[PDB]
Symmetry: C3
């Protein structure tokens, strides 16, 4: 079976860019990853259905709809994993008006059957401040505490995925002024 890696982090923690940088590094040494964005895969389906204009509105849809578009996005990537080792960029849980939506519910977890789950964190202070200057996307500008709460539930969910699939769960800190350290750590676990 092809390696399936799940990378997660709350919006603004920089899990996407730091993992991308790590995978650019591993490319230069023979390691290849099919970087997939779970969010983009379901965004294309949600936009195609005229439900959303931008990716940041999907978590505002009612759970029933989010889970349906989630189920679909799952099959897409599961089929995508059949050709090469996949690095799925996504979320341990999504913060919706109805609460934390598990990003990899029972059935999706089984489709993807990941070997590794990476959780990229940092402090809520840094995450708020980063979201504060980011004009590229629509963030929820919560409090450092709310962001910590989200990271708390992400750990819980991530560890559940690990217990169900046997996947290992890696927690990596991506702190301000320390991206290099984060990239090195991510590169080693993904190698």
């Amino acid at each position: 079976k092809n390696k399936v890696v799940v990378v997660t982090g709350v919006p603004g923690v920089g899990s996407t860019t730091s993992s991308q940088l790590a995978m650019d590094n591993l490319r230069k040494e023979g390691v290849n990853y099919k970087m997939v964005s779970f969010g983009s895969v379901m965004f294309e389906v949600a936009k195609e259905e005229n439900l959303v204009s931008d990716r940041d509105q999907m978590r505002k849809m009612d759970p029933e709809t989010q889970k349906r578009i989630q189920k679909m996005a799952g099959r897409k990537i599961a089929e995508m994993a059949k050709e090469s080792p996949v690095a799925v960029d996504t979320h341990s849980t999504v913060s919706t008006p109805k609460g934390y939506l598990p990003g990899l519910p029972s059935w999706v977890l089984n489709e993807l059957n990941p070997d590794l789950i990476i959780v990229v964190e940092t402090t809520g202070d840094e995450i708020l401040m980063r979201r504060m200057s980011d004009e590229t996307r629509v963030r929820d500008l919560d409090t450092a505490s709310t962001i910590e709460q989200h990271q708390f539930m992400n750990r819980c969910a991530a560890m559940s995925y690990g217990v169900l699939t046997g996947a290992t769960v890696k927690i990596v800190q991506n702190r301000n002024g320390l991206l290099d350290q984060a990239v090195e750590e991510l590169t080693n676990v993904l190698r």
Copy 2:
């Protein structure tokens, strides 16, 4: 077909009080939840078999007895899950002398198959303080920290239930002097 909701909280956090007020609010606008107490559907049995006379000692009768009066208790509520909007007042985990007992183990969970799991919290100081002025119930011997620990594990359990069922997990603070704030939030998520 009917929206099933699980409302949880440690004793004294007032999860029942607050969510009920929210459901009263939603009645005046159409939404009419049927408030059912798992703690009642699961008490009619213990009181019958003379296992438990007082509701506040079911979590101590026997780990191999309360887990048995739980399974059937859920099978009965699994029925109303085929009626109309149902709100199940129960516990994420019950603090028994043998440890934290999951309130929605795999079996019971599949019956209810909830859409939303609500976790009502507040600081250990406030919960401990509320308990100390309550006599119609007895469960005081804990500390602000043991209460936090229980809430810690309740978050974990709740999220695992979410992962297994696809349900969203909503955490609501019900802080002293701010019941109106909690009620507003509960009203919005329950809609």
Copy 3:
């Protein structure tokens, strides 16, 4: 017969604390067969000629390790028929690739545990204990990383109970307070 999982990070003394407690129960009529899950894995893997030395236990590929885990679980479930069993193991093992579940769902289904015990203490005391130990003086862990491991161990433990219905008991085993931990363990295992 009760199947019990005893966990704790290295250095917390979960194994020794549990043993003292099980001895105390022995002198009371309750007899627990204490086994290490890792040892059981090696035994069954050696019995079916998958391995010869415990050194090769690391070289096992994902498929064979899963098989060995099921075999260990089936074996322990076999022991359960004869007496209460205490499986000494790790909720998660802190590896370079992250936290590895000690008891994946496929093992949980075989074990059907009734109680998961989680023994803890502060990161400071755990690091202190490890430093005054001849073997571990070059692991680079801090009180914080140990707290993080204990955090993930709690989530894994709670997930174990959610999937099996077992109760999860957290027990503090603090410096100078061993007797108290032993009494608690003695009471939860009784």
